[PDB]
Symmetry: D2
Subunit: 359 residues, 4 copies
């Protein structure tokens, strides 16, 4: 169990950007710019800096060329310059390695702290950032599939309660979770900015990065991404969806970048900013918890996720989950799911919903 | 092979209504009225008469209580009273059983002919119908999932080219179809009213009724149907979707009524009313043909369909398809499909797309 | 009254394209391509040929450079090649001037008949046209404001009953109209393809072209056109809307091109294909007939419209409407309208709504 | 000028509910429940307690039968019970009249402080509230016009800078405003929850309540409200819109309840939670600032607004604005507005846009 420091936690505002290492920068650019329509803040031979339609900070996504595709940093913006100092002190007390750069790790970020957190994830905390033209009313640029915000990250980690307690001490509040009747936690969602999530924990081998999520204004915008991917004959890069979530109540889609980094497109979750916001716990065997319409969760969604780097740029070693596997208990050979609690009708034994089994 | 009569074909306007036999009228009422929001034109202990939001004829759907759930009639409106006489002459020349009732078979229909057609299907042809209040501007009644029109029927039959040729002689024009490189036809779509389909043929054991389709105004209306069925904890009655079709380009959903009759909800196909409307043929192994986003077709979609009745109310005997099965050649153990023709990446062998095999 | 020819009417499928004369081709191209997103089928230094997202015929709009902005032709597709011969015999019997070009008037159209019709409008009838790539599943090209079909034309003419009867003889069926209790007709809508309209008649001084209409898939696509025009700081070229129509029940917007040609964007009217489709008549004083939400109709919408050309390319002389004016009877100084019939609450007198 | 207290400001989370006095409780019920689809948390013969589709606190709107239609309270939720003590100390030092009830003023609210604030408005601050079934996934109940959240209030007040400085001290941050080139401020928007606004100030005679605003998920939900009101033949209770705002960038509609209280329906503004969120200032003569599409703003939108009560239940006296009037300088007889700055084409002298 990760102890609560004496030092005060940094005041985190929100998730702000991710730095992803990619193997072919031009292929990646084609995906995030030509397919997804993200706005280029800066680019050169080594990096692409991208932002969403409504962003005023320099970027929400940095693509960095490197030999091994991986998450290099998931970056949170903090409330003041002094909060970056607080972050350094807090993580030092946790016994974590930290690196401080007064002039930033990436362009358009100033004083920044990166840490190898207790779950092995590379986090950044910063305040200073270059403001850019906020494109929120540039409807001359607006795409039929326009990505308007960065919304959240999702992390794969083998011990969800351990992580959850650490994120609670850092000031994140859990909005929803998935548990069973035998004491196992499979997933949790937690926030700072008053939406369902800024980060989320998914039970599995880790540290790995599950996805980064961007939002759209309306559901039809998500449908358009799917439609465009069909027209580009890259529908094989739609992993799962589109759907309605149980957890979060958002309409959603998961797609895969050229290095298999998973991106979620999301819209219309709900307000969580009250401190006693009712926490919602779903049972892992409820077949409406992940897709509210009951559609089956594709097995790659549970098994595949991105490598993460340490501060030297080396891939973090994976620690195997020993708690029960959500895949196995729901759609594997001994799995079970229900539509209506206690009703045998609409239940699934040892296979997925809608007449499918695991490939 | 079905000969083309010397007698003139009736001028068919559109699909107009279906009569389905249902086993429990109150449970069927709940589904069609309380879940789906269709509007009651007439009802009693034996039947419920339903119409869509923009309809002016008496009804689009008649639920008739009986012992065996089945299609009893699929009805087309013809242009003039004289076309009913033409339908009668045409089918008598084909050597089909016909029955004529000057005062209709169901309420709100007047002079009508029912026929056991050459494919075993119970067709009705009529002109006269009782006009009712057209609810098209009754936004005080409009539901978030409102069904606005009847769009089409889909019929299962063993020999698609044989049925197609017969429908062409009747004046239906083929818009899209699905074939393979060795000359098998798996499905065909054909219209009179200048949309993609008024009826459609799906290759399989027949005669059976695949579905009846209603349209909505917008894609979010279809999303709401899914969302409501989740809230009612009947997501197990969502069979397939929602999706974008390849064939037709419509946004779609398939759901199952209490007797397992399949209902499609559909919106935003394209104009086909020009006589040289370009036909579109798809390869059966193209994994974007049915769902444009490459999502897998649930196997029940290929295997299950409603019984149909003859003019005495007995179930029509089923005849086995001997051409190749669409299920088997795409998603069965020996099936295959592709995202990009010729590309092994994004292809599926011996299972469905997205990492599933047959349950 | 325009007599019915004994010659059979051509079988008209739908409205197909308009040829608009424009004064500055580059400015016009910026509006129809860069702002509105129509797809180029052909261009050169004299003309731009444009189509909507789901079209397979060569074009829905031809922009032709010329000295005076005007409608040059409103073209209907007919069902077979022989229907062009029918159209020629029909308009000849009507006493109208006609011109037949076996290889077409504009690129991508074959054998074509143009006429000065009895209302003074330049109509074209054709069958043959060059097919192009139908872009209906080209979602890589799809705009947030995408125009998906050509829907209809709207003509300004002084005597609506006279024009309506002429159109009915040609096979158009009236779907909706606007009348008063005194028996005046102010407008009528009529169709061939099974929607509310392929053309429509607006009472006023004519012949003038009121607008050309394109459809979108959804309401949000119309919203996006407005939002884009705001970002381009040309919100002054939004004339009226967005709104819900009473007549037609369609969601709508009216905008002005650089020569003040009016374009409607339109979605979600209803099916009219049955021969006994119920006809709806609105009262001219009903403030929900034009905009269902009761928003006022700007006077420019009633008074302004495009010149039309004769077959020589000269402007057609205009005839003044002598029947009552819809403008005057609803929003002029002696006009009125209501929200609920016979209720002075929500009524407007000598004054527009709201 | 309103001084800044030595006492620390309460930590305000968001606008939470409004209490509106209405004259005919049945007619109001019909509007808010039958037309608009709000959900009943509690009702009796004197009061209806309503909530939006995604709310879990007891209510977002209280309709209270009374003899004079008016705003009785605009309530903000604070982060902790001790924040209600802070609000009490803060307003006392301001020399504002306060009243504190441990068991609340309305049903479903616990310990609560009401104040007559320095602008004459009745604010409530509370933490304690009765939790109710969150209906956010009750799509069996979801209306085609569904109102999903309470978004904001908008207040009419004569001196916008005076008001702004006071709200800033209280911890609200200004996101957008409307000024001219002569030093006048006509309007300002400001927030706690990270949206464009929790409350907003409109320059005018006041204190008056301009409107209360509810959100929808999508733009088509607002369009459905208009379509329904047409079917119900009450399109005359549509005041302004639907439209796209300049300020806020939100899609919007303004409608009027049976006592003429103005309700806005609103969707899809942007995130403002960062402390250095760029402030946007519009010029008052910019014809895209209120409606981005340049549709004219009807003069009733500028002149009409609801009475507000003091803590005894009496109507607050109205103080006249002496700063220039937004109405007069844009759409009055000597008004002006532009489409493109510096372009005569698309400008309007002495009248509203669009004819
Ligand atoms: O403004 S109207 O409701 O009369 C109307 C209805 C349909 C149209 O296409 C139109 O331009 C005008
Ligand atoms: Ca268990
Ligand atoms: Cl999920
Ligand atoms: Cl399909
Ligand atoms: Cl405004
Ligand atoms: Fe997520
Ligand atoms: Fe279908
Ligand atoms: Fe029109
Ligand atoms: Fe507002």
């Amino acid at each position: 169990e990760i102890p609560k420091p004496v030092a005060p936690a940094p005041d985190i505002l929100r998730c702000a950007y991710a730095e992803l290492v990619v193997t072919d920068l031009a292929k990646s650019r084609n995906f995030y710019v030509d397919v997804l329509g993200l706005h280029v803040s800066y680019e050169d031979e080594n990096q692409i800096y991208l932002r969403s339609f409504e962003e005023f900070i320099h970027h929400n996504l940095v693509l960095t060329k490197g030999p091994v595709a991986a998450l290099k940093a998931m970056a949170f913006r903090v409330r003041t310059p002094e909060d970056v100092d607080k972050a350094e002190a807090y993580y030092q007390e946790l016994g974590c390695r930290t690196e401080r750069r007064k002039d930033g790790f990436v362009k358009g970020i100033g004083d920044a702290l990166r840490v190898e957190d207790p779950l092995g994830f590379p986090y950044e905390f910063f305040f200073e950032t270059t403001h850019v033209e906020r494109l929120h009313m540039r409807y001359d640029l607006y795409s039929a599939g326009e990505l308007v915000r960065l919304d959240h990250f999702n992390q794969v980690t083998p011990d969800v309660p351990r992580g959850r307690k650490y994120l609670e001490d850092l000031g994140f509040r859990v909005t929803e979770d998935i548990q069973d009747d035998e004491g196992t936690t499979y997933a949790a969602w937690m926030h700072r900015k008053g939406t369902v999530e800024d980060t989320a924990l998914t039970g599995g081998n880790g540290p790995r990065l599950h996805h980064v999520a961007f939002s759209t204004h309306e559901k039809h915008n998500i449908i358009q991404i799917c439609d465009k991917m069909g027209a580009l004959r890259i529908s094989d890069r739609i992993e799962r969806g589109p759907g309605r979530h149980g957890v979060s109540n958002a309409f959603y889609l998961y797609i895969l970048d050229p290095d298999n980094h998973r991106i979620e497109i999301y819209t219309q979750d709900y307000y969580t900013g009250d401190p006693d916001n009712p926490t919602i716990t779903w049972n892992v065997h409820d077949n409406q918890r992940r897709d509210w319409w009951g559609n089956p969760v594709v097995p790659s969604w549970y098994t595949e996720a991105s490598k993460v780097l340490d501060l030297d740029g080396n891939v973090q070693e994976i620690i195997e989950r020993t708690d029960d596997s959500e895949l196995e208990v729901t759609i594997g050979a001994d799995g079970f799911s229900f539509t209506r609690a206690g009703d045998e009708d609409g239940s699934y034994h040892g296979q997925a919903s809608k007449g499918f089994k695991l490939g």
